[PDB]
Each structure stands twice: as C-alpha cells, then as structure tokens.
Design a protein around this ligand. Structure first.
Ligand SMILES: CC1=C[C@H](O/C=C2/C(=O)O[C@@H]3c4ccccc4C[C@H]23)OC1=O
Length: 266
C-alpha cells in the first residue's frame, strides 16, 4: 500500500479531472517523462512511478523468482492504482510497460479506459509468418554481451536505442541505463524476450493508440500493423515523423502532440 508508493517512487502531479499513468521502459525511470510532462499537467492528473527494475529503485526489492514474468509487474501497477484509490484511468506506457499495460487491461478492463502504446511489440523473437525483428542467436549474443561487459554493452546500445543523433538524449538514456544493476538488466531483458503476447491481444477491450516512429531498433514497422490488426479494442496507429525507440527523450514536443490527441476522449 503506502510503502509500495515509496518503494516505487510514486508521484502524482498536475490538475485535471482525467487521470493518466505514465509508465517508463527498459533502461529509464520516470524522469524520462520530464519533457512531455508539462503538456499534460494542465489537463490531466498524472501518475508517475518507477518499475521495480529501475536503477532508482533499491535492488533489494527485486525478487528474481517473482519477477520472472510480466504479471508481477502488473501486480505492482494494480496495487499502486488501488493504493491511490484510482477507479479509472488512461495508461501510457513505453516498451516493456506497453506489454505490462496490455496485460493489466485484460486483468482489470474496468480500470483502463484507454491505452497508448509507445515502442510496443507483442513478441520480439521471429517466428513462422511473424517478423519480430530478432533471431535466437542475435538475442543470445546480446545476453552474452550484457553478461561479459555490461558498461561496454550499455555504451554501444544507448545511441542505437535513441537512434537519432541527439547527444543530450543519448546522455540522458545512458545515465539511467548504466545505473541499472547489471544482473537485473539482463533478467528483465530475458523476461521480455521470452514473452509472447500475440495470443492474448484479442482479449483487450480498451481503445488503443499504437505510437510508431519511422525507425525503431527493437520494433519493425510491421509490428505496429500487427498490433492494430490483432488488438481486441478499437485501435489506431499514429506515426511520428521522426525515428528512435525513445521519442519522449529524443523528440518530446512531437510525441506530446500525439499524446494530447490520443488522450482527448476516453
Ligand atoms: C523492454 C525493451 C525491449 C527493447 O529491446 C531491447 C533490446 C536489448 O536489450 O538488446 C537488443 C538489441 C541488440 C542489438 C541492437 C538492438 C537491440 C534492442 C534489443 O527495448 C526495450 O525497452
């Protein structure tokens, strides 16, 4: 309840009758939302928190057996909302949090009025007649890299993830990426890559906006199309006119426009 609010560094800011949850992705924490936040705070009550795997959350609270699937992250999210006494909200989440949001909307359809998914994929691994963008050997090489020299891995990965040449964004992402516990980073990455949400997408009742950039290193353009086609609710794909996996860091003013539009009516 209240302790969880402290453990996950929960914050509520802004004024408006409508509630939005901003849920960060891998390698970041809630500070990643800082640039888009001012566009929202006039019209919304905004909840921010850190995922348990965030570097800004004490690694002692991370349970390796518990967090071995995304449903545990969903537990934390639902427990946060119930603690804050929020009966209904819109959920915006990035990367792994998009996955968490999908699962939470299935668990508690009454709680989630709308989903906005950024850099979202149901499955990263390739399959028969499914292009996720990665092959088993490719991902294996990553795990080895994260395992052998983590900082070296992080140094190489951060600019690929940002993907546009935006030195300040690369730096901000590196701050929170390097500060992650290397073993927790690997674990989350292993959990995510073993996740296949394709089968449950049809169970989502909430209207969804899939936000897609021109180039995402972990998310092929065809995946956004797949989500729109297979999500059970009314779904639209919004395209950003710029590239990268972290548009809230790399082009926050552009992402804010799509968000303001997506959160207009839910
Ligand atoms: C949860 C989440 C998944 C996602 O892809 C994560 C990746 C990672 O860690 O190494 C992988 C890799 C290896 C080489 C080049 C790019 C990437 C991106 C892949 O981005 C996220 O935030």
């Amino acid at each position: 309840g209240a302790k969880l609010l402290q453990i996950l560094n929960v914050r509520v800011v802004g004024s408006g009758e409508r509630v939005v949850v901003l849920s960060h992705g891998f390698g970041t924490d809630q500070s990643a939302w800082s640039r888009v936040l001012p566009y929202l705070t006039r019209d919304h009550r905004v909840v921010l928190y850190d995922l348990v795997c965030a570097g800004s959350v004490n690694p002692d609270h991370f349970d390796f057996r518990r967090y071995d699937n995304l449903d545990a992250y969903v537990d934390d999210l639902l427990a946060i909302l119930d603690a804050l006494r929020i009966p209904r909200c819109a959920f915006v989440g990035h990367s792994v949090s998009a996955m968490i949001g999908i699962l939470a909307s299935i668990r508690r359809p009454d709680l989630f009025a709308k989903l906005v998914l950024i850099g979202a994929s149901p499955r990263f691994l390739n399959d028969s007649d499914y292009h996720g963008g990665f092959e088993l050997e490719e991902i294996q090489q990553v795990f080895d890299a994260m395992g052998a020299n983590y900082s070296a891995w992080a140094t190489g990965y951060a600019p690929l993830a940002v993907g546009a040449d935006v030195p300040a964004a690369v730096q901000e992402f590196s701050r929170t990426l390097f500060n992650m516990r290397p073993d927790i980073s690997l674990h989350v990455c292993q959990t995510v890559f073993k996740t296949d949400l394709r089968g449950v997408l049809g169970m989502v009742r909430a209207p969804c906006v899939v936000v897609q950039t021109t180039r995402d290193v972990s998310v092929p353009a065809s995946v956004a199309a797949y989500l729109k086609a297979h999500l059970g609710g009314r779904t639209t794909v919004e395209f950003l006119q710029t590239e990268g996996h972290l548009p809230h860091l790399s082009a926050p003013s552009l992402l804010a426009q799509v968000l303001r539009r997506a959160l207009a009516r839910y």
